[PDB]
Amino acid sequence: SAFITFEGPEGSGKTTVINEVYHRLVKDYDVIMTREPGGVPTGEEIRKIVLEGNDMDIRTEAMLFAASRREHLVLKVIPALKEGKVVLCDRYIDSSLAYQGYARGIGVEEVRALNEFAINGLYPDLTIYLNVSAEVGRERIIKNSRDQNRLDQEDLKFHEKVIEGYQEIIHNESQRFKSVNADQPLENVVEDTYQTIIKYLE
Amino acid sequence: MSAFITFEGPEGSGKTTVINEVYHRLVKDYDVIMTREPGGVPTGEEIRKIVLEGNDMDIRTEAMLFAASRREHLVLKVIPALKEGKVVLCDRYIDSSLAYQGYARGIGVEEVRALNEFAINGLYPDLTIYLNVSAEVGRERIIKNSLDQEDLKFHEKVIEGYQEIIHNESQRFKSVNADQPLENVVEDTYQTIIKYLEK
Ligand SMILES: Cc1cn([C@H]2C[C@H](O)[C@@H](COP(=O)(O)O)O2)c(=O)[nH]c1=O
Ligand SMILES: Cc1cn([C@H]2C[C@H](O)[C@@H](COP(=O)(O)O)O2)c(=O)[nH]c1=O
């Protein structure tokens, strides 16, 4: 069994990548594609309070992500792993570390401690990081709305802090981290990602 | 100026009725507000609802939801009131989590205390009234309002849990004998609070 997570800032093409990678693997392996809360009832309710998020304490936000993470992990990830499946997970602990910890400013280690209580030490066997530059990310983001409003000074600077945050987390731990160049065209990002995962599975 | 006073106690301690009457006595001489989590806080209420409805919910998830609701309530209601110099009477706070999720549920008091430290950011109560009722008295008052055995044994673990938390911090803690008739528990509780606000 293998618990593989995918992390990356906005505009890294993560969602389309994980989707195509999964379609390639589904044939040769017993692989499931998932994302938090991933259909978990309680997890879904918890997550709904967040996206319809109107300036809720960042600490509350952090905790809700942690709580949703827990439900999903226990009710969906762990069971799958016990059945010997390969679990492809769109975002995990690292997302919280980068977004709530670094970008939001709560403090990476403080948020990592919160999540340790949630994941009980169950870290990913492998974590693919789609390393896209802020500029490339920004371009992918605008082509998906083509009317830049949701993209202003702060929005753009926040997206930079996130990347900075990832750079920090990836720096300390590179044991479970395997990076990929998300600055390339998406077809190449997928191939590279696929290869990285096949190697690990061999 | 302001005082953050919490009330803790197991089931059947008469806590709710106590805080209510104590509050009515203070409302006259002090600028006091009576609250409970989530205390009408929108986000807090939504979070609490999930606890209310959920069945066999993972205890750690439960603990985190209580912590998340605690945060909203603290920041959107308690802190603001304290900055306005009010006396805040709060029905249950961090200690409830330590006793129920930490001790009784078995997650571990310190592990749950750490979770909540992230939530309250070190904002502990100025005073915490503990309604010390025995399991047996609690059982009776409860039977008097409304159920089983391992539920009766859980009620005991909670009390045990409270016993543990109490004599590790008798700085905030001020105990009251909830085994007495409710009228007496209220008087004692009121006096303990007036002494603290007077000194
Ligand atoms: C899982 C997770 C997501 N997020 C955010 C970042 C993403 O913009 C969003 C989920 O978007 P996505 O479905 O496109 O990956 O939620 C956090 O801030 N912290 C977390 O722990
Ligand atoms: C505030 C809080 C309550 N509880 C429980 C115990 C009580 O039975 C219930 C609230 O009931 P009450 O309003 O009568 O005090 O929720 C916890 O388990 N943890 C907490 O942190």
Ligand 1 pocket member A91 (CB < 6 A): yes
> After which residues are there C–N gaps above 2.5 Å in chain A?
none
Q: How far apart are CA B53 and CA A66, in angstroms?
A: 20
B92 close to ligand 2 (CB < 6 Angstrom): yes
DSSP H helical segments within chain B, as ranges?
15-29, 42-53, 59-73, 79-83, 94-97, 109-120, 135-143, 150-166, 182-198
Name the CA radius of gyration of chain A, rounded: 16
Atom of ligand 2 nearest to the CA of B105: 18
Q: Is B110 on the interface with A (CB under 8 A)?
A: no
Q: Which ranges in B109-181 belong to alpha helices (H)?
A: 109-120, 135-143, 150-166
CA dihedral B107, B110, B114, B117 (to 10 degrees): 120
Tell me if A6 CB under 6 Å of ligand 1.
no
d(CA A67, CA B51) in angstroms, rounded, equals 12
Which ligand does the CA of A67 lie closest to? 1
For residue A66, what is the nearest residue in chain B, using CA coordinates?
B64
Distance A58 CA to ligand 1 centre (A): 13
Residue B83 neighbours by CB under 8 Å, 6+ apart: B2
**Residue of A48, A49, A73 to mutate, testing the B interface (most B Cβ within 10 Å of its Cβ):** A49
Atom 18 (ligand 2) nearest CA = B100
Cβ of A95 closer than 6 Å to ligand 1, yes or no, is yes
Distance in Å, CA B132 to ligand 2 centroid: 16
Question: Helix axis angle, B150-166 relative to B109-120, nearest 10°?
Answer: 70
Instruction: State the Cα–Cα distance between residues B82 and B64, nearest whole angstrom.
Output: 25
User: Which residues touch B181 (CB under 8 Å, ≥6 apart)?
Assistant: none
Resolution in A for the shown PDB structure? 2.3
Virtual torsion, Cα A186, A192, A198, A201, nearest 10 deg: -100
Cβ of B111 within 8 Å of Cβ of A117? The answer is yes
List the single residue in A56, A67, A70 with the smallest CB-CB distance to B43: A56
Contact B115 A117 (CB under 8 A): yes
Phi, psi dihedral angles at B7 (to 5 degrees): -120, 130
Residue A3 belongs to domain with CATH number: 3.40.50.300
Residue for token digits 């129920």?
B100
Q: Where are the alpha helices (DSSP H) in chain A?
A: 14-28, 41-51, 58-72, 78-82, 93-96, 108-119, 134-142, 153-172, 186-200
Structural domain span for residue A11: 1-202
- Edge-first strand listing for the sheet containing A86-90: A31-35, A86-90, A2-7, A126-131, A177-181
| A89, A4 contact by CB (below 8 A) | yes
Provide the token pair at A8: 């990356």
Q: Do the chains contact at A42 and B50, CB–CB below 8 Å?
A: yes
Please say whether the beta carbons of B14 and B131 come within 8 A.
Answer: yes
Number of domains, chain A: 1
B8 closest CA partner among B119, B150, B169, B194: B169
- Tokens of residue B121, six digits: 């950011």
A13, A15, A18, A19 alpha-carbon torsion, rounded to 10°: -120
How far, in Å, CA of B193 to CA of B27, rounded? 13
Neighbours of A111 (CB within 10 A): 26
Way it was determined: X-ray
CB of B97 closer than 6 A to ligand 2?
A: yes
Amino acid at B43: T
> With contact defined as beta carbons under 8 Å apart, do B19 and B34 qualify?
yes
Q: Comparing C-alpha atoms, which of A31, A24, A114 is closest to residue A77?
A: A31
B195 annotated as belonging to a binding site for a ligand: no
CB A12 within 8 A of CB A182: yes
**Residue A63 to residue B60, Cβ atoms within 8 A:** no
Distance CA A139, CA A13 (A): 11
- CB < 8 Å from A in window 126-185 of B: none
Q: Check CB contact under 8 Å for B43 and A63.
A: no
What is the CA(A163)–ligand 2 centre distance, in A?
Answer: 41
